[PDB]
Write a protein that binds this ligand. Structure first.
Ligand SMILES: [Ca+2]
Ligand SMILES: [Ca+2]
Ligand SMILES: [Cl-]
Ligand SMILES: [Cl-]
Ligand SMILES: [Cl-]
Ligand SMILES: [Cl-]
Lengths: 128, 128
């Protein structure tokens, strides 16, 4: 069971920390070109691993595979599964301030909703 | 190469026509669990193939992998690539009438925006 050069193994996955700026959509499509998807956080061990990387790279945020379709309405992971705050809650959460903030990125130790077209770094994930 | 039993080959893909009702999100989940994604239409030949199936199965509509994160926002395929009306235009397009209509399905020969949570059939796609 292998990961590609420059991808990091943890748990049951391979990870690319992409230090390049893209909208959330551009990030999704970059991960897709690599046969991967934007990060889905599945458990606490996965979260703490990711967080140990994002908190050590806190100059930019990293787009992840979490988004909603309505400007407030349910968060869903890139595989279509529902969000549960098992490891973290999405931050910036009153009605008004959340307006058009429909995609999610990690910045340091915090997971934030954000305007989808914002240029940021990203994390891709592929199964080990 | 090969497609799974009950998946149909066309062009460079294998297709599952899923005759089971789900939300757009639930359809996304089902395709993801099969190592697949919701239909992405890449070309006119692919569209015409799909349309010969949807127009012969008109009792229900089929969720596909096209959605937007806000109603005043651009459609994107499930791989993050931008939508272009090469084969079809999404139908129901005046501002006020397509609010909360943020996911796309095919019904017969037409592609419509719809309320994401609506239950219908779906089409999964994976590479041949
Ligand atoms: Ca994961
Ligand atoms: Ca396709
Ligand atoms: Cl993704
Ligand atoms: Cl978790
Ligand atoms: Cl999908
Ligand atoms: Cl059309």
């Amino acid at each position: 069971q292998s990961c590609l050069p420059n991808w990091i193994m943890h748990g049951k996955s391979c990870y690319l920390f992409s230090f390049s700026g893209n909208s959330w959509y551009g990030s999704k499509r970059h991960c897709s070109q690599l046969g991967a998807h934007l990060l889905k956080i599945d458990n606490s061990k996965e979260f703490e691993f990711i967080e140990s990387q994002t908190s050590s790279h806190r100059i930019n945020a990293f787009w992840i595979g979490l988004s909603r379709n309505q400007s407030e309405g349910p968060w869903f992971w890139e595989d279509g599964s529902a969000f549960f705050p098992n490891s973290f809650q999405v931050r910036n959460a009153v009605p008004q301030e959340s307006l058009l903030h429909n995609c999610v990125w990690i910045h340091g130790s915090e997971v934030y909703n954000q305007i989808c077209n914002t240029s940021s770094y990203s994390i891709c994930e592929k199964e080990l």
